[PDB]
Write a protein that binds this ligand. Structure first.
Ligand code: GUN
Ligand code: GUN
Ligand code: ZN
Ligand code: ZN
Lengths: 463, 463
């Protein structure tokens, strides 16, 4: 039908920066002046301008000037029904769910409210740079239906599903394991793998899931092997204690999900925070992934996710970063990277022996430094592999879907542009590009997101 | 000469919220529709609209509509010469100073560069909501002179001084204790208490101050009792170790400064982070103050400032929050409050016994929750008392200087206004006001700063 070509400064990844200590540039791919040829929303050719322009004689080239074009940000952990309540005051995980979250999520039972939230949810995500997300919904199929459908109109790849909740929640909010299986089964029928929609069996979290509800998820996963599994794991100490109480026959939090064959490829456990090295090794082995949500971890007091452990090359764990809106107070992955770096630097101090020498470990302390290479790989290619959708997204490789963002390195607080000028203007090398991207992360915010494209179509453009 | 009256929704403090557990509203003062009469930049009358409008028949009332007017934010710890380098990658305190800070601060030797930095420094502060700040400069008198003078043109109250550095820094950057005393003496002459300028004897930090340099500060403080003392204390573990090495004859970091009579009223020690309860008690007793810089503490990996300990009612320590630009990555006190709350919530989890019951302490765990009352009192009245300038600033009490900010509760990321609407529109009670201010802190950023006034004069107005 149509074929357009995007021109400008491009920056993406072809490998994991963690795999290149002291030489991360090798994981990045930079084109000061490149051209991407997208046909019907699919990359067909990527490379330097001349060479590509020449191989494609008459294509309509759209020139995004003075920006750094990167792949659309992947957010592996948001709560759709929490879009309106992301700054609840005073509570840790548990009392907060009861006090501020459930009373709001219950409103999504009403289809009109659900439709409006879904609209605002997706608008906030686009204005933030996020083109793909794995979303939690409420226990009512309504919110899930409205989300998949509005996602279709914008034709965005999205992972979502009915979020079952069995115990420890209001009676009017929880719903029977039977109905959950029934509804999830219906929703998988109507939405899974239709267009860019992907379904995820979603037992909210062990603490709120009776063994019947989890047994239901097990059945669902068995009758629908292609479906994803999305949940929470080891986020709060009180939560961890309760879980082993609600599930007396299990050794660790991850053990609860393994008892039902939920752990393996396409499994995402939000908030590592309190996972043991054993639990990390097990996930690495089975291919399960963890979602690092720093903004939330800090806002709710959960703690410091051990980034250096999950990235251990001997037992590498698959990951995707997350905003965790509700728990987290920011919709942008750029804001997530800000807190992600902070958590990692605090970890660096805990592992260098400056305090307790017996806990020292420089290799891990080094892995906690979130460079612009590591941070941006994590919200794109890395997040794609962590969600097992790297065949469709992650970078500008031909054959992948064309979701992308035009970053304005000068956006953000007043201090940004004089800071960025330390590098005149436009980035001329992969190092200068990486250097400005770190400034986007730490000195700027969503004001750096100038344009958000989905399938070769520009859905957003900062006023 | 002139007399103007500001009208609109006002919110300020008359007491410490910490002093009112379970009833913080009592520390706040709310006027849904009030009028402030300022004559030549000095509050002359404050109170509800009618009553004030009536007592002042023909005053030019300027109506700031749809905003929440609060006192100008006090920032007790910024580094002027670091304005351009606030997002340096990969290092903890020490290696970072060597790698990214000194090479930039040395440029301020040149008066043209210094003049431009001072300009950008103050612009960033105003666009951020900060009207008063205690600033660190470089070792060259130039940067200090240019700062005081540009502060005069805008007529802003500012605490600053020659930042002496003796050891552990480049040779071209450090300067003799003699010259330091000489120059500081000159600068105190020309600037201290002239207009709204206040001088602070500034030994950068024990680690970089030979006993001669500190003995010089002692002399200065003795010949100029009215001058402030500004420095750093216990920010990094490696830094703490080095200090006790560079000062073998002292027991604790605070002990180094007491050896020279620097600790007492008007003393500010940046970054509590590694202070002992004994050190806190000593400061509380002598009246010295600590400056909590959460953004910096997290960015450099320093750690979690024990907010609950400094606010201990039996040994209350005077405070002022700080951005610490350079170390910190944000110029706004609103952004500082975001990380301040996060540090405090992580502390709440460490003190509630959910992990180690022997370390439990609910009274302190409670004091770590940064409510909109506690947070905003800290960046205004609280910060004023912590800097001993509460006679001139802090709130809208008649006789105080009229520095203020018009906050737009709807500013910030896309999600803000649907979130704030959970309260139709305009705040009708002190609770609704506090409720929206917490959303300013956590869901918004500097985009919430619509107007910044200094001495009854509007210096800034968001485009
Ligand atoms: N992100 C998040 N997920 C949850 N699942 C159950 N409780 C929580 C929570 O507090 N935060
Ligand atoms: N804020 C801050 N002050 C200092 N004084 C000496 N070193 C430091 C540092 O790393 N950060
Ligand atoms: Zn979650
Ligand atoms: Zn400092």
């Amino acid at each position: 039908l149509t074929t357009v070509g995007i021109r400008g400064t491009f920056f993406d990844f072809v490998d994991d920066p963690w795999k290149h200590i002291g030489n991360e540039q090798a994981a990045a791919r930079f084109h000061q002046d490149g051209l991407m040829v997208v046909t019907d929303g699919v990359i067909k050719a990527f490379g330097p301008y001349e060479k590509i322009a020449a191989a494609h004689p008459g294509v309509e080239i759209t020139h995004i000037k003075d920006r750094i074009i990167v792949p659309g940000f992947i957010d592996g952990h948001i709560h759709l029904p929490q879009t309106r309540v992301l700054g609840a005051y005073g509570e840790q995980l548990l009392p907060w769910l009861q006090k501020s979250i459930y009373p709001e999520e219950i409103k999504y039972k009403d289809r009109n409210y659900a439709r409006e939230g879904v609209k605002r949810f997706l608008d906030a995500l686009l204005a933030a740079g996020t083109t793909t997300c794995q979303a939690f919904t409420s226990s009512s199929p309504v919110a899930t239906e409205e989300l998949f459908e509005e996602a279709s109109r914008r034709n965005m790849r999205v992972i979502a599903g009915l979020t079952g909740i069995d115990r420890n929640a209001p009676a009017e909010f929880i719903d029977t394991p039977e109905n959950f299986y029934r509804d999830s089964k219906r929703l998988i029928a109507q939405y899974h793998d239709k267009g860019r929609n992907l379904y995820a069996i979603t037992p909210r979290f062990a603490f709120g899931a009776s063994p019947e509800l989890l047994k239901a998820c097990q059945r669902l996963k068995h009758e629908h092997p292609d479906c994803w599994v999305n949940t929470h794991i080891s986020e709060n100490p009180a939560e961890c204690s309760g879980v082993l109480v609600e599930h007396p026959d299990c050794q660790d939090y991850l053990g609860v999900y393994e008892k039902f064959d939920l752990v393996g490829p396409k499994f995402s456990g939000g908030h590592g925070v309190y996972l043991s090295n054993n639990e990390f090794r097990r996930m690495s082995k089975k291919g399960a992934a963890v979602v690092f949500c720093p903004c939330s971890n800090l806002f709710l007091g959960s703690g410091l996710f051990r980034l250096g452990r999950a990235t251990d090359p001997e037992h590498r764990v698959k990951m995707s970063f997350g905003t965790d809106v509700g728990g987290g107070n920011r919709f942008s992955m750029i804001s997530v990277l800000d807190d992600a770096y902070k958590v990692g630097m605090c970890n660096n101090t805990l592992l260098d022996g400056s305090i307790d020498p017996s806990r020292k470990d420089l290799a891990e302390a080094e892995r906690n430094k979130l460079s612009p290479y590591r941070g941006f790989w994590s919200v794109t290619l890395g997040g794609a592999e962590g969600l097992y959708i790297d065949d469709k997204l992650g970078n500008f490789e031909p054959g992948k879907e064309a979701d992308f963002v035009a970053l304005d390195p000068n956006g953000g607080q007043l201090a940004q542009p004089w800071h960025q000028s330390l590098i005149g203007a436009g980035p001329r090398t992969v190092d200068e590009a990486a250097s400005m991207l770190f400034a986007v992360m730490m000195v700027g915010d969503d004001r750096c997101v100038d344009e958000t494209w989905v399938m070769g179509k520009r859905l957003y453009k900062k006023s």
